[PDB]
Amino acid sequence: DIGRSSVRPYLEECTRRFQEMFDRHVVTRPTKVELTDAELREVIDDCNAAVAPLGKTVSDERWISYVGLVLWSQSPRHIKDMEAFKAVCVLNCVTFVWDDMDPALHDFGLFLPQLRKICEKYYGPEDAEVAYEAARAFVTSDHMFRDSPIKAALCTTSPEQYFRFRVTDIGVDFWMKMSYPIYRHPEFTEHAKTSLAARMTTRGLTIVNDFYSYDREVSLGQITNCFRLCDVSDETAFKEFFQARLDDMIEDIECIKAFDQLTQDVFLDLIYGNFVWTTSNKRYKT
Amino acid sequence: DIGRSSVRPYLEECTRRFQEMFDRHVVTRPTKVELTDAELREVIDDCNAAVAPLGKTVSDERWISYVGLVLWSQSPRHIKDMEAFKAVCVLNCVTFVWDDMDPALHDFGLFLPQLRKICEKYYGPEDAEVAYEAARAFVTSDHMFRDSPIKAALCTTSPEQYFRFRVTDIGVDFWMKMSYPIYRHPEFTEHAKTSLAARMTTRGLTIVNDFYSYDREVSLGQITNCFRLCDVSDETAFKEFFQARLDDMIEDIECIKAFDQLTQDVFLDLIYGNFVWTTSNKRYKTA
Numbered sequence: 124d125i126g127r128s129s130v131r132p133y134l135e136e137c138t139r140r141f142q143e144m145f146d147r148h149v150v151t152r153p154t155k156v157e158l159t160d161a162e163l164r165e166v167i168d169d170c171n172a173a174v175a176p177l178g179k180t181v182s183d184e185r186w187i188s189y190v191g192l193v194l195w196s197q198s199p200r201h202i203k204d205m206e207a208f209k210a211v212c213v214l215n216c217v218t219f220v221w222d223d224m225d226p227a228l229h230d231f232g233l234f235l236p237q238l239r240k241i242c243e244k245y246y247g248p249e250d251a252e253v254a255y256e257a258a259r260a261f262v263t264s265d266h267m268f269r270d271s272p273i274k275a276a277l278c279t280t281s282p283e284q285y286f287r288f289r290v291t292d293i294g295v296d297f298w299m300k301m302s303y304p305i306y307r308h309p310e311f312t313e314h315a316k317t318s319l320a321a322r323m324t325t326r327g328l329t330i331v332n333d334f335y336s337y338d339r340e341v342s343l344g345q346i347t348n349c350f351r352l353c354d355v356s357d358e359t360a361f362k363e364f365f366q367a368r369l370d371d372m373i374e375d376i377e378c379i380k381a382f383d384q385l386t387q388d389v390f391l392d393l394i395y396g397n398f399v400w401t402t403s404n405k406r407y408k409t
Numbered sequence: 410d411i412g413r414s415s416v417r418p419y420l421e422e423c424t425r426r427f428q429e430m431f432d433r434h435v436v437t438r439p440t441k442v443e444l445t446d447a448e449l450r451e452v453i454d455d456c457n458a459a460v461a462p463l464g465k466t467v468s469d470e471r472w473i474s475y476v477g478l479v480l481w482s483q484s485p486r487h488i489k490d491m492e493a494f495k496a497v498c499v500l501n502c503v504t505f506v507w508d509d510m511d512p513a514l515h516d517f518g519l520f521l522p523q524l525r526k527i528c529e530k531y532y533g534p535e536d537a538e539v540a541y542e543a544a545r546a547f548v549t550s551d552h553m554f555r556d557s558p559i560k561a562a563l564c565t566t567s568p569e570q571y572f573r574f575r576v577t578d579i580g581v582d583f584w585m586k587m588s589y590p591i592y593r594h595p596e597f598t599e600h601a602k603t604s605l606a607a608r609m610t611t612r613g614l615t616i617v618n619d620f621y622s623y624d625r626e627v628s629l630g631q632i633t634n635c636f637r638l639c640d641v642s643d644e645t646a647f648k649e650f651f652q653a654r655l656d657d658m659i660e661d662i663e664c665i666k667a668f669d670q671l672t673q674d675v676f677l678d679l680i681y682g683n684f685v686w687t688t689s690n691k692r693y694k695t696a
């Protein structure tokens with residue numbers, strides 16, 4: 124169905140409605156962390172060093188585009204450890220590269236030691252092991268589920284099964300487990316380590332990403348996108364599905380407000396910051 | 410509200426319908442691991458040593474009742490490492506004790522080193538770290554959420570929020586992360602480590618546990634039970650809610666059958682075994 128090849132007809136209204144929802148339920152805007160020139164050079168140098176064994180040359184412009192996710196979606200008022208912050212910048216960037224690679228070019232023997240080097244550089248020993256395991260689990264999951272029947276079943280059955288897959292696959296469990304050292308906040312550290320932090324934020328991250336990455340993904344034959352569960356060529360069907368997804372986001376956001384003040388700031392800054400970054404990034408345009 | 414204080418009016422019919430569902434959708438019955446008298450004594454001795462610093466005496470009969478969960482809900486055809494199996498017996502048992510304790514008697518300084526000792530006895534070094542971290546995160550979660558407003562929000566809002574809390578709180582993530590060394594199966598190891606294994610099995614474990622532990626939990630003022638989300642004193646409301654939960658179990662089970670054969674056996678033996686153990690255990694027969 125060529126009518127289902129694009130969500131472009133809904134682009135402007137959906138963007139407006141996402142923003143309206145955030146203004147009504149989160150209110151406080153995300154803020155962009157600013158890196159010094161020295162910090163941004165350090166981050167890019169580490170990204171280039173990590174993907175060089177895989178034969179990939181990545182421009183500064185591409186790295187800076189991927190790093191904007193971290194700059195916009197962390198919680199600047201609560202940052203305590205800028206070394207952990209740089210680590211998340213590097214790890215976020217290089218796993219975008221992995222996510223985009225053909226699996227024939229994936230090489231664990233070459234890439235996993237680079238992830239370990241990044242973690243050992245920026246984290247103390249215990250946190251380094253936690254961040255590295257989460258990175259390893261994510262890149263392994265991305266690899267093993269390429270064209271997988273498990274992925275097919277979880278992504279075609281219901282929203283419940285799909286979001287369950289995405290807790291790992293969209294990277295948010297990884298994100299929380301490498302981000303808690305930024306904040307040094309005992310409650311958030313526990314929610315990161317139980318993955319409750321990831322489970323609370325999966326839908327709000329995923330629904331936004333899926334909307335803006337739909338056209339690209341379906342053009343590439345990728346099935347990991349919740350809007351494939353609906354007939355996007357039927358305007359009534361799309362409207363009902365989109366509203367059900369907005370309701371999921373709102374329910375999660377209202378439950379996130381029961382968490383402690385710092386933790387809920389981190390969770391909400393992540394979901395809203397991802398939206399601000401997604402709508403500004405050429406990755407998601409045509 | 411006394412009419413909501415019990416699910417006893419539904420006990421026989423719900424038990425029958427759970428079993429019918431398993432016979433239709435899982436088919437293969439769970440089977441019970443048998444421990445030698447020496448193995449069982451080694452497990453119970455480790456349990457006693459681990460909880461002794463907390464001042465608790467626990468009878469053998471009581472340890473045996475908790476260890477039946479592991480004997481019934483692992484996957485005997487796939488067991489390769491019986492030391493890992495004994496570790497799960499011990500860790501399962503002692504965290505029931507933690508789950509039943511008044512939190513004023515929780516002592517992390519005394520208990521966490523005992524959990525570390527168990528993991529170091531039975532697993533290799535990498536696996537021991539994974540099992541200990543999962544056990545530590547579980548007992549920390551149980552403690553910090555006692556009477557917590559986060560718990561109140563997640564357990565009163567919707568089934569979605571509730572089962573999200575239970576991925577950790579029922580202990581299944583912990584179970585998976587201490588059980589993958591039993592099987593030495595690379596795919597299952599990865600689903601355990603991503604917690605996809607736990608997310609796939611949470612509803613089937615939790616709906617069954619919640620039904621049979623409702624009366625006890627309500628009598629103690631505990632709110633972590635999905636049947637509190639429905640008016641159990643209304644037979645029509647209870648029937649609709651129960652059917653919705655059966656449908657959730659079936660959807661999970663049918664999706665589980667897309668995993669590799671060994672992994673799906675482990676997942677399904679866990680869900681069905683938990684039901685067989687729950688319906689035969691005195692823990693769930695009096696409040």
Ligand SMILES: [Cl-]
Nearest residue numbers: 256538539542
């Ligand atoms: Cl670990």
Ligand SMILES: [Mg+2]
Nearest residue numbers: 222265292293
């Ligand atoms: Mg991906």
Ligand SMILES: [Mg+2]
Nearest residue numbers: 222223336345
């Ligand atoms: Mg992608």
Ligand SMILES: [Mg+2]
Nearest residue numbers: 332333336340
């Ligand atoms: Mg996407």
Ligand SMILES: [Mg+2]
Nearest residue numbers: 508551578579
């Ligand atoms: Mg409990």
Ligand SMILES: [Mg+2]
Nearest residue numbers: 508509622631
């Ligand atoms: Mg309990």
Ligand SMILES: [Mg+2]
Nearest residue numbers: 618619622626
């Ligand atoms: Mg219970």
Ligand SMILES: [Mg+2]
Nearest residue numbers: 412413642643
């Ligand atoms: Mg009534």
